[PDB]
Amino acid sequence: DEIDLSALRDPAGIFELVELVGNGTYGQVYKGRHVKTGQLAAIKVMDVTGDEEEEIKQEINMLKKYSHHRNIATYYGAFIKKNPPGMDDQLWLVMEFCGAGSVTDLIKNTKGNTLKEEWIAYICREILRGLSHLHQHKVIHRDIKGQNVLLTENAEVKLVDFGVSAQLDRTVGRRNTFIGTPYWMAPEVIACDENPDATYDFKSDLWSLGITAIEMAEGAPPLCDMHPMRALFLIPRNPAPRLKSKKWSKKFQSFIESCLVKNHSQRPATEQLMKHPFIRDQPERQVRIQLKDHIDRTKKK
Ligand SMILES: CC(C)n1cnc(-c2ccc(F)cc2)c1-c1nc(C(=O)Nc2ccc(N3CCN(C)CC3)cc2)c[nH]1
Ligand SMILES: [Mg+2]
User: Fold this and answer.
1) How far apart are CA 245 and CA 18, in angstroms?
2) Is 193 a catalytic residue?
């Protein structure tokens, strides 16, 4: 796990920045086009500062090792633009371009800001397959949310942004860093803010998945109205958030119930959530026509 950012080549005459599509923890993410081929790629540009140096090395290594997986946006390589001595250099991280954008963007471009149970089931399983791969390699994402779940032109689900992700040595290993997006953060993660003896593990990603499912169902996560600091206080003490409507199937209500167990000890693991009827029983690996058509309607207008 040794990266040198000196032997990296200049991106001039290879990739160019077309438009800004989003941002990722540290950096601004662009739609990059290859100068010759016209091949599209997601490119995160960020200043190589001493404060965010080891956190960028962490990301690259994690992407080099695990991004091959079909449910993780594939890392191609890195370039660097040299600013004059004393100034910070621009690091370019090139990656698979997810043409349809984020789950959050699909929600906003759907009637009543609510997705079908069958899309939520499909996406939730693809996220679980991505998380299962990561957790098996002692990885915690620690920032699972609609914004970090992207879709390709083929409506293939991809996890992105390993900027606040943890690499563990031992299987039973634990973390204590208060990090993530407040609305999606698990209670045992939020505990670490004030309590210095509090520790968490991979289970925290399965809570965030639970909130991401509610995000897809209702259009936004629980406590999205109030201030993040006003939300961080209630998550640990309030009862597990549920779906407002009862029109949702009993199996989908059961999946949110399984995901959002506040006590991480009683919470099911990744492999257990895969066997849950909501994940196991779906109409799969061919029939995603509705999604591919839904994003084609967005392309026109
Ligand atoms: C931003 C995301 C949270 N992110 C954080 N960090 C990295 C990243 C990028 C490159 C690397 F090498 C490493 C990390 C990434 C990352 N966004 C992508 C990506 O493809 N994003 C994308 C593409 C298209 C859209 N459109 C919006 C408008 N219309 C509806 C059409 C679609 C929106 C967003 C791929 N990776
Ligand atoms: Mg991949």
Assistant:
1) 42
2) no
